[PDB]
Paper text:
The domain composition of SARM1 includes an N-terminal peptide, an ARM-repeats region, two SAM, and one TIR domain, which mediate mitochondria targeting, auto-inhibition, oligomerization, and NADase activity, respectively. Subsequently, studies have demonstrated that SARM1 is also a key part of a highly conserved axonal death pathway that is activated by nerve injury. In this way, SARM1 activation is triggered by a decrease in the concentration of a cellular metabolite NAD+, rather than depending on the introduction of an activating factor.
Cryo-EM images show that adding 5 mM NAD+ to hSARM1 has a dramatic effect: >80% of the particles show the two-ring, compact conformation – in contrast to the <20% found in the absence of NAD+. The structure was largely identical to the GraFix-ed structure, further substantiating the validity of the latter. In the same region, designated hereafter ‘ARM allosteric site’, an extra-density in the NAD+ supplemented map reveals the binding site of one NAD+ molecule, providing clear atomic details. Interestingly, we did not find a density indicating the presence of an NAD+ molecule at the TIR domain active site, although this site is not occluded by the ARM domain.
Residue numbers in the entry:
A (entry chain B): 242 to 700
B (entry chain A): 56 to 483
C (entry chain C): 484 to 700
Write the structure that this text describes.
Amino acid sequence: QRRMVEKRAAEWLFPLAFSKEDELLRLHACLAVAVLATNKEVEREVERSGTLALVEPLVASLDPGRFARCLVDASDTSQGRGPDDLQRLVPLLDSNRLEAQCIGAFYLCAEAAIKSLQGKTKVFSDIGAIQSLKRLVSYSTNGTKSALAKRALRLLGEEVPRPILPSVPSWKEAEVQTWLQQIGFSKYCESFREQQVDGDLLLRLTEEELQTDLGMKSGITRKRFFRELTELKTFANYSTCDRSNLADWLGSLDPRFRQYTYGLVSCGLDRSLLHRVSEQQLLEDCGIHLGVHRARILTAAREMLHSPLPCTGGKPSGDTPDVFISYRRNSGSQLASLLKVHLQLHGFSVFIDVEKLEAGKFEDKLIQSVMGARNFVLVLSPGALDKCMQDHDCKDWVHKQIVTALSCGKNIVPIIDGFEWPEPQVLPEDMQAVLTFNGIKWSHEYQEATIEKIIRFLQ
Amino acid sequence: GAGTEVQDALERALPELQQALSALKQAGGARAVGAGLAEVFQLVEEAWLLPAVGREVAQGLCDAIRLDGGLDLLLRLLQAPELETRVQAARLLEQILVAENRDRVARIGLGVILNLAKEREPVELARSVAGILEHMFKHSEETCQRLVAAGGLDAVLYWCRRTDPALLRHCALALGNCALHGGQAVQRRMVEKRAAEWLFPLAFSKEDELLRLHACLAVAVLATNKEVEREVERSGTLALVEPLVASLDPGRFARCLVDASDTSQGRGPDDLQRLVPLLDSNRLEAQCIGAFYLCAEAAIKSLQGKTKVFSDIGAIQSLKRLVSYSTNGTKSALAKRALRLLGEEVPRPILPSVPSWKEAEVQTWLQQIGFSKYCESFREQQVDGDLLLRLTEEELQTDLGMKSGITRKRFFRELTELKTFANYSTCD
Amino acid sequence: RSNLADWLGSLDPRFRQYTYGLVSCGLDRSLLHRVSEQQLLEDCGIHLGVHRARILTAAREMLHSPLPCTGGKPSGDTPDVFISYRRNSGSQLASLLKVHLQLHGFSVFIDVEKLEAGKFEDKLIQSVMGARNFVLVLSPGALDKCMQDHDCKDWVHKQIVTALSCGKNIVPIIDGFEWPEPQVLPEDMQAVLTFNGIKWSHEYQEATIEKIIRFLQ
Ligand SMILES: NC(=O)c1ccc[n+]([C@@H]2O[C@H](COP(=O)([O-])OP(=O)(O)OC[C@H]3O[C@H](n4cnc5c(N)ncnc54)[C@H](O)[C@@H]3O)[C@@H](O)[C@H]2O)c1
Ligand SMILES: NC(=O)c1ccc[n+]([C@@H]2O[C@H](COP(=O)([O-])OP(=O)(O)OC[C@H]3O[C@H](n4cnc5c(N)ncnc54)[C@H](O)[C@@H]3O)[C@@H](O)[C@H]2O)c1
């Protein structure tokens, strides 16, 4: 394999995988690249050829049964493969290359058709195929891969597993019984039920708990369990617990470190605290057993401190709003909300009248907010100044807000959107002055352009 | 019988479908196409709005569409430069995207959809494009990541500045599904694309009460993600969640569900297990919107008789822990209503001053956190609350008889919750 | 991934048996210089102290002389060459060009996509604008669907036009191609014919390729 790669074999499989003439020539030239890519040492040169690119698209294109009909309906490769050529496709299903797991599941599907027609599906059990297809289904994140692996598991009459919900921290006791049944510990279901292991209790299981409490006597069985578990821990969504994406820092050291996320975030370490953790703590608290791993996590931690030092941050504490959106509670609601977003996106602290009440503390905090905000945006919607008309009792909130704004000499910008201009005299004198200000017309279509115009006006 | 009812309806529906398929073989300029599209559209609409057993009829109907020209027919028609035909096909697709038909579209032609999405102008179209998107984001993380990477989220985030009732109802139900189904990676992106800020105009709606309810599940689900929590907060959309949940009535949005044809039985056992991790967040906003939804569902599911869901999901134990340690009226109101509708024993709130508890307050809290098996031993040994805040593993193991080290880990977790709620005014 | 098995065997043939134990802790050749004896013992499972001490000693000599330093791969997203071809006909010759040129160290952009649809004239067009050279497989019927395509719908058409517009180095590869009349092509792409074509020898592939390389920038 090293030599084939050094002789540029991947690069020369390109003209055969990119064939437009034969569909078998591409299928055959794709088992070739997919097998080479399974070799970790030549993986990165096989990738650089850009031949692996073509694998997944193609497996998608084709149909299993049809290349099983180019086999069983043909004289050549009648029974397809035999029990020793089949046990060379099973280590494809178990690579970390999607390209290889797809081409692998395509071939195993085709064979599962043939071998079911005949009646020899016992192969697939001894090869160890069935348990490997039901683990491309459980943890798959690709449609092609799972399509084929489900077709296969059906053709060989097995129970097609359901995909595992990824957010393990959140699992209850029933999601744990399910995952135990899909990784073939269905014998320890009763004891995981008696003790009510849910998913925070599972991501935290120790050898002693496994041994004593769950009754996994064998130390080989425990080693087999903790291997399944380390797969799940690596697939898991930790969005609920991780706040610093420690899971992606741990995975950037080394993909098999991502399994230590929960243990580290359940001690409330984060990226900003890792630089001060000690080896004994990585061992005793966070549960990282391999010293070799402990020492890498640790070393990299002290390099954050050096170059990517997580320094103190700061968020806008300016309680003072920049803009105050005044609007007819019923009519202008829409336009006001839109203004809020646009302006907020352009970095303007916006005060809208979130309150639906328009009551309680009558003209209280809202009025202080006006006095607080440099700019005063006025959604002139249809009927905006209708209840302001001859409201010399200064009861209308819009009224009060306008008056307050005028009184402070605030920058007022009205947003003409349906508004029929009324006669000054129909409004109380204290608010007639609102009409002197130039209104901006809102374009329901050219929202962005309109907004730029509005921003020109603000202070 | 039930089966027969379904069959007999289909015995007319299936033939009728085959006829519209003929009009969909006849390539009119906009004629035989437009008509034919509209024909089958109406034929499936009837089956969806069937007030009897109609879900099953329309399931059968949509299946047959897939097994007879598929969605491929419509997906080609979705490219047809005739606006009318594009529009009529959009309408049809939106209403037939069931599970199996969504798997197909995901494979065969998601790239068609993401090209239709670039067109944002005809509102009759946009309505349905946005509608397709809604059901497509409900597919798988892969499909989500694909609809986000190509501008499919960017379309539902532009149609939030629009005004059409149904368009917006589609746009919010969509960011809903996308946060709920997209995974860690998609959630970060939605937040980075300012999705929280664009749910503001939908949660602050004065026109529709469902549009706000739907735009609030969207923010409340995003805020549950600890990594994007602080940016979701900065939008000021979470502000609106709690006020609104208060406003509304559970039963009434269960009557906008069970008294309606759409979402008849509300949610199924897998859409329900996505509301339970809301009850368990640390966000009040999320625990409220979560308990609102679970209340509405507890009404529906009690009417029917399927309340066994709530036990396996793990809802019941989570509502009786929003009741025990709650410090908010809204939250507890809903969580008590629910626990009643599902005929459980509504717990009493725990008195917070634990140091001062006697032996009876400890027996009560043991019964509410489901250690009611260790009540006798906590009584024999007269654990009161200074003795409880001080329990050690050895005391738990030897003296109380909590043999299992997993049971002790489960106990000390409940205990660490109580210790965090406790009033310590007497000692501190 | 690092052939630790052949480093361990070069110390001493009976060390090769420790490969799996060392690579299941995700040591590799580039990390061995920092491992400790207790870790060789507890993690990697090497029992004989005498062995531990040799593996260890040799490890710290990598650090010295065969120090595994930081590497670097081509991050030049910019392609050097863009292979434009008739999706059905030129496929073969295009693929061949891709390999030959890639072997001679030219970032090659072929139209891997089988679709010729989806995002119509989108990323592919940016790729043209990105790549210094524009190689054109003139296969039989290459410019036939480009003929009077004033609607600029043909991708080949668009690609050529984009290439001309940017003033890209265009090199056509004559392989079956009957030269058409300029007037039969849209004016925006008639200029393609002004460029000297290179004849492809299905036999003398290497020689042909050297000729092609002379032309590239
Ligand atoms: N129809 C044809 O033209 C045809 C048919 C088969 C092979 N051949 C020729 O036959 C020659 C012999 O090579 P081969 O294919 O026998 O080598 P091989 O036995 O090493 O090839 C592996 C074979 O295992 C499979 N297999 C399934 N059940 C089997 C069984 N019971 N016993 C043995 N194999 C079984 C297939 O038959 C497959 O060909 C090849 O050189 C080839 O050119 C041609
Ligand atoms: N009356 C109507 O107009 C109407 C009714 C329902 C859906 N639809 C259309 O139907 C299409 C199909 O989408 P969908 O809603 O079937 O997708 P889906 O099955 O992924 O949606 C989840 C569904 O689970 C719930 N559920 C409760 N019990 C269920 C059961 N026994 N089986 C399945 N689901 C159960 C609800 O029915 C809810 O709709 C949608 O595109 C939509 O436009 C319209």
